[PDB]
Amino acid sequence: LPATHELHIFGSINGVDFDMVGQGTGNPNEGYEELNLKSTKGDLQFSPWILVPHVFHQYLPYPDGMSPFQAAMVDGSGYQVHRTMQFEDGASLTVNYRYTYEGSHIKGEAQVKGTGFPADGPVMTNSLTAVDSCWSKKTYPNDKTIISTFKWSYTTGNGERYRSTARTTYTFAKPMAANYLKNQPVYVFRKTELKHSETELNFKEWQKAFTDVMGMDELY
Amino acid sequence: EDNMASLPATHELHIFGSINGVDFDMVGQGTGNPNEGYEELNLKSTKGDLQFSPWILVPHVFHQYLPYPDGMSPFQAAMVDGSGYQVHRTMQFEDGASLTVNYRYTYEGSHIKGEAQVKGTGFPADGPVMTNSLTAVDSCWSKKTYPNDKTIISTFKWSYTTGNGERYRSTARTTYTFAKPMAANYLKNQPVYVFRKTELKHSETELNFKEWQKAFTDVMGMDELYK
């Protein structure tokens, strides 16, 4: 179970290179995590909001014990993550995650590639103001894979929603225990907070999983 | 087990009052699914164009539609018994504005008639409420406690989005007064967390409202997550 983490998040938005590193803590019994990120290449020339929710499900417990994300970390086996975001304006963003566990400390490597953002849109003009809390639906297509789907929205400087759909594929090196497979789908609620400058992000995230729940399809 | 399939599934609302002395009055018919926590409502002004943000009437525009994980909510139990409950909600805004809503219900058979008396005061004259420049609301959790056998107190943090993409924040407290004491399975099982999503399509004289709600019991780390 983890207490501390660090993130190296890097890549390009519309070919604009960015690199950010920082340290964080959390409570893996309550699904809380905190992160400070600093630009290693000066002022971000795009909305810092575009890095949310991408800026550690090792912090997410399940109702009656560890999440499969936690079980895989404790075992040492671990998991890789591929997220694809498809935006209402035709823009696309991909994030690849690689983790190492230097003790009870998680080291995150997040490779991001974003293309097709309109030059005068709110992402490239840094005019996004907020994000909404979000439900995700987690299914186990096989005993090695978790696919998470959610609908994501940013608020723009004009008070409109800037919408995207997301699919996250979790690939475990080692199968998930049998007693995870009997409980699907799994619905997770997440709230995030971001305080930011041009070079620094202060991120918080609260998350909670719900298992044998009826009438959650339209609601999520 | 409770006869959930038989619960009333039609309602009407008469919502009226004033916002900074701007009088309004709307009447409309709705339907829903009390087994799945879904309700729909159409409202039409009886006094022409609303001269403030229709968003200010959300979430105020029927917890008779809300089931509990193992049966009737107390709201539905009180309706089925016939004793019923009354509602008082206070919204306190970041700019010092305040809004109160008093609800009274009567059950004309399977049909719920709600009367919602609204008084909003203290809104800045050139703010987004009085100038009709609010654009949206967020989905919201509420926490319900039972301070005594005839009372439910619900608290939540509410936010509107403004024309500038900022949050216009309020804190809310809703007190439910039951004419008859609530059953044992309610009082021993607290607090209750309710997640709600709303949809609003509106003109200056007509609102089309939708709400989805789901109650959760015996949940652990909800203290900060629900806010």
Residue numbers in the entry:
A (entry chain C): 13 to 67, 71 to 235
B (entry chain A): 7 to 67, 71 to 236
Pull verbatim passages from the article behind this deposition.
mNeonGreen, an engineered green fluorescent protein (GFP) derived from lancelet, is one of the most brightly fluorescent homologs of Aequorea victoria jellyfish GFP (avGFP) yet reported. However, we were ultimately successful in creating a variant, designated as NeonCyan1, with a tryptophan-derived cyan fluorescent protein (CFP)-type chromophore, and two additional mutants with distinct spectral hues. NeonCyan1 has the ‘double humped’ excitation and emission spectra that are characteristic of FPs with Trp-derived chromophores in the neutral state, such as mTurquoise2 and mCerulean3. To obtain insight into the molecular basis of the empirically determined biophysical and photophysical properties of NeonCyan1 and its variants, we determined the crystal structure of NeonCyan0.95 at close to physiological pH (pH 7.5), NeonCyan0.95 at acidic pH (pH 5.6), and NeonCyan1-T207D at close to physiological pH (pH 6.5).
A late-stage variant, designated as NeonCyan0.95 (with Val67Ile rather than Val67Met), was used for structure determination by X-ray crystallography. Inspection of the NeonCyan0.95 crystal structure reveals the locations and interactions of all mutations introduced during directed evolution. Notably, six of the nine mutations appear to be localized in a new dimer interface between monomers A and C of the asymmetric unit. The asymmetric unit contains four molecules of NeonCyan0.95. Calculation of the interaction surfaces between the various monomers (779 Å2 between monomers A and C, 439 Å2 between A and B, 312 Å2 between A and D, 272 Å2 between B and D, 272 Å2 between B and D, and 0 Å2 between B and C) strongly suggests that the symmetrical dimer formed by monomers A and C is physiologically relevant, while other contacts are likely due to crystal packing. The C-terminal MDELYK sequence folds into a helical conformation and contributes to the interaction interface. In the case of NeonCyan0.95 (pH 7.5), the structure revealed the dimer–interface interactions of the protein (discussed next) as well as a water-bridged hydrogen bond network that extended from the indole nitrogen of the chromophore to the hydroxyl group of Thr207. For example, there are two well-defined hydrogen bonds between nitrogen atoms in the chromophore and amino acid side chains. One of these is between a nitrogen atom of the 4-imidazolone ring and the side chain of Glu220, and the other is between the nitrogen atom of the indole ring and a water molecule that is part of a hydrogen bond network that also contains the side chain hydroxyl of Thr207. In addition, one face of the chromophore is closely packed with ionizable residues with side chains potentially bearing positive charges (His72, Lys153, Arg205) and negative charges (Glu45 and Glu220).
